[PDB]
């Protein structure tokens, strides 16, 4: 009975690890991807008896707990630098260290961060990645012929 529960526990745990691994393998080649990994930790153990100090001519005694089941503590993403390949499109930078690109669906009220960089112009002037979002940054002022980074 007890062993059945612990046994099904380990089973679903390994299931959860398999899903994450399945994702990692599933999207090799996608740009800017960072793989994750599952982590396990033991469930609370029942303690049938308490440990005891030596007394009347006897020695001490070890605690007598059983220990039941296993479960997933957390996933962790990992952010090591990936390999690079050149392309023929000039407008597709890839950062070489740390930090992310910003994008937003709006005026920038809700930024999203990415390491992918398939940036491209539309028929209109806006400077867009794949599927929609316009990359954040800042434009030149023709009166001065100068970029104004501070704002």
């Amino acid at each position: 009975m007890r062993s059945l529960w612990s046994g099904v526990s380990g089973l679903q745990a390994h299931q959860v690890a398999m899903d994450v691994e399945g994702n990692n393998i599933s999207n090799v080649n996608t740009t800017g991807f960072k793989y994750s990994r599952a982590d396990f930790g033991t469930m609370f153990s029942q303690t049938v008896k308490i440990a005891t100090a030596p007394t009347d001519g006897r020695g001490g005694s070890n605690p007598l707990q059983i220990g039941l089941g296993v479960s997933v503590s957390s996933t962790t993403r990992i952010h090591s630098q990936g390999s690079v390949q050149t392309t023929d499109k000039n407008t597709d930078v890839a950062i070489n260290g740390d930090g992310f690109f910003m994008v937003s669906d709006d005026g920038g009220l809700t930024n999203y961060l990415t390491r992918s960089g398939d940036f491209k112009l539309d028929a209109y002037g806006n400077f867009v990645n794949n599927a929609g979002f316009v990359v954040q940054g800042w434009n030149i002022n023709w009166d001065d012929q100068t970029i104004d980074s501070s704002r």
């Binding site: 009975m1 059945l4 612990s6 046994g7 089973l11 390994h14 299931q15 690890a17 398999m18 691994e21 990692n24 393998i25 999207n27 090799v28 080649n29 740009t31 800017g32 991807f33 960072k34 962790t76 993403r77 990992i78 952010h79 090591s80 990936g82 390999s83 690079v84 390949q85 050149t86 392309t87 023929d88 499109k89 000039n90 597709d92 930078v93 890839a94 950062i95 070489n96 260290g97 930090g99 992310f100 690109f101 910003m102 930024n111 999203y112 961060l113 990415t114 390491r115 992918s116 960089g117 400077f127 794949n130 990359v135 954040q136 940054g137 800042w138 434009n139 030149i140 970029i147 980074s149």
Partner: protein
């Protein structure tokens, strides 16, 4: 088309106190969250954040051997626990058949 070649724009980037604390979305997007940090906007290479590399594209960091071996590990552990449950069932059917 004139002789001139003015710079026409400039790209900001940003950094968080804790990568991997921040949550994932669909697409290649990430998202700010608690246990992550604030966006900390800055320029391309001065805050301790790395430079752009033009005309090149950055592939995924997934090593593959590490992945396949884990496909083995997970499978075998799964098999074992699958044995535990089975023997645990058989002991139960011996219990119920004990009375007959």
């Amino acid at each position: 088309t004139n002789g001139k070649t003015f710079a026409v724009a400039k790209i900001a980037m940003a950094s968080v106190a804790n990568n991997s604390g921040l949550e994932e979305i669909g697409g290649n997007l990430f998202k700010v969250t608690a246990n992550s940090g604030n966006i900390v906007v800055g320029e391309a290479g001065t805050g301790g954040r790395g430079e752009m590399k033009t005309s090149a594209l950055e592939m995924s960091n997934v090593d593959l051997s590490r992945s396949l071996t884990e496909l083995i590990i997970i499978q075998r552990g799964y098999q074992a626990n699958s044995k535990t449950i089975s023997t645990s069932d058989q002991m139960l059917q011996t219990l119920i058949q004990l009375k007959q």
